[PDB]
Amino acid sequence: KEYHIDEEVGFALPNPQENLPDFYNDWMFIAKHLPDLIESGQLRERVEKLNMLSIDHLTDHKSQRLARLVLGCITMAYVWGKGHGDVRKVLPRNIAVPYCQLSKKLELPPILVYADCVLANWKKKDPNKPLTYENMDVLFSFRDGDCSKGFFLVSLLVEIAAASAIKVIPTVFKAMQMQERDTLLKALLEIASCLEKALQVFHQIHDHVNPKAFFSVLRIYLSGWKGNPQLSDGLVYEGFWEDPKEFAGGSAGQSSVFQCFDVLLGIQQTAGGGHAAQFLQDMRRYMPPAHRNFLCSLESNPSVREFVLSKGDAGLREAYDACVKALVSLRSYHLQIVTKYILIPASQTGGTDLMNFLKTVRSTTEKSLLK
Numbered sequence: 092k093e094y095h096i097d098e099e100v101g102f103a104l105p106n107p108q109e110n111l112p113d114f115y116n117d118w119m120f121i122a123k124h125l126p127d128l129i130e131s132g133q134l135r136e137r138v139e140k141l142n143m144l145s146i147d148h149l150t151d152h153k154s155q156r157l158a159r160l161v162l163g164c165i166t167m168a169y170v171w172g173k174g175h176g177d178v179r180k181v182l183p184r185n186i187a188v189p190y191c192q193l194s195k196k197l198e199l200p201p202i203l204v205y206a207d208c209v210l211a212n213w214k215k216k217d218p219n220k221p222l223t224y225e226n227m228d229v230l231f232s233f234r235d236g237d238c239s240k241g242f243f244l245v246s247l248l249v250e251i252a253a254a255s256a257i258k259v260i261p262t263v264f265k266a267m268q269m270q271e272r273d274t275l276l277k278a279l280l281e282i283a284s285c286l287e288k289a290l291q292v293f294h295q296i297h298d299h300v301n302p303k304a305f306f307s308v309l310r311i312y313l314s315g316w317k318g319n320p321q322l323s324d325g326l327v328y329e330g331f332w333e334d335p336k337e338f339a340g341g342s343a344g345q346s347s348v349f350q351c352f353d354v355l356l357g358i359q360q361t362a363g364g365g366h367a368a369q370f371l372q373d374m375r376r377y378m379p380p381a382h383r384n385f386l387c388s389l390e391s392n393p394s395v396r397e398f399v400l401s402k403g404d405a406g407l408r409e410a411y412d413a414c415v416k417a418l419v420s421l422r423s424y425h426l427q428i429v430t431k432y433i434l435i436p437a438s439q440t441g442g443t444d445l446m447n448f449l450k451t452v453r454s455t456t457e458k459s460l461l462k
């Protein structure tokens with residue numbers, strides 16, 4: 092696990108910190124009570140009433156990641172506020188320096204990202220109960236009725252469904268170099284199987300998230316400030332950085348999961364020109380460095396796709412296509428989500444720009460079938 096891939100939860104953080112050192116009890120309070128400090132308005136002030144606390148008292152990883160989640164959740168709330176059109180272009184040097192320093196340690200950007208607000212932002216209610224929606228809960232939200240539990244948790248639950256496939260991958264590459272056909276064939280079907288499993292889990296998002304509430308409320312606090320005509324120049328990290336600085340928002344578009352399998356199955360997303368590829372390449376910078384590296388390792392390994400074609404073996408061809416189909420299925424569904432949770436709400440040219448981007452990626456994935 093030098094790629095930080097759990098056998099159980101994959102790219103997620105197997106059971107993150109709930110509690111910070113006391114030195115940072117200031118930080119934990121503002122964070123822990125965000126529904127109230129915005130719904131009141133003494134958040135923006137209470138952030139000003141705060142020391143430039145040091146980073147050094149954060150001993151281990153899980154601490155730094157909670158610290159990133161806390162500092163992250165806090166930073167989104169200050170900058171956006173009520174999220175009604177009253178924004179900051181200035182961030183205090185009580186927060187900017189300790190968040191900017193931390194986000195050089197972990198080589199993440201100083202913005203709330205998927206890694207923070209999904210992978211590191213979850214808890215188990217009853218330790219010795221399964222991993223199901225009912226028996227889990229997030230660490231931090233922004234407002235009430237935003238359905239932050241819905242989004243973060245179901246996102247996470249899909250990450251975990253994928254873990255079941257990601258642990259097969261070692262087998263795939265071994266079988267390939269050992270020229271062990273039957274093994275490889277199995278391995279490929281198991282991956283298809285588990286990605287089919289992961290789609291069912293994707294359905295849960297209807298059950299646990301409201302469209303109007305997502306689009307209206309939570310979408311705002313996840314949104315960053317690149318090409319964002321409310322901070323058109325950017326956000327200023329007072330103290331740390333001389334100028335304003337552009338960094339992009341924290342979608343599930345920052346996940347490693349889809350990309351992981353794009354690479355495994357030799358789907359050249361990040362090749363070609365275009366904003367489709369450029370986006371997908373750009374997103375890797377918002378993933379933990381371990382995970383960036385894991386994807387890089389997959390690319391380095393020999394091509395599954397090439398192997399399969401080289402063999403003249405309908406069994407493999409089939410199992411390969413199974414995996415590809417599972418991945419298209421997932422994306423074809425993601426689209427239905429976006430329609431329901433963005434397109435429709437947003438009517439109550441940017442709209443079709445988004446969908447064409449997603450359909451490009453879907454299509455690229457489709458184009459990789461052998462059938």
Ligand code: HEM
Binds near residue numbers: 342350422432
């Ligand atoms: C209400 C639920 C969801 C909405 C509204 C939504 C919306 C979007 C949007 C608008 C994008 C384009 C990138 C951006 O503008 O940020 C996107 C990309 C993406 N989303 Fe989601 N999403 C949702 C749930 C999920 C979940 C649960 C996953 C995975 C666990 C996921 C995985 C992705 C991925 C991987 C991309 C990058 C494009 C790709 O590789 O296919 N999304 N999503």
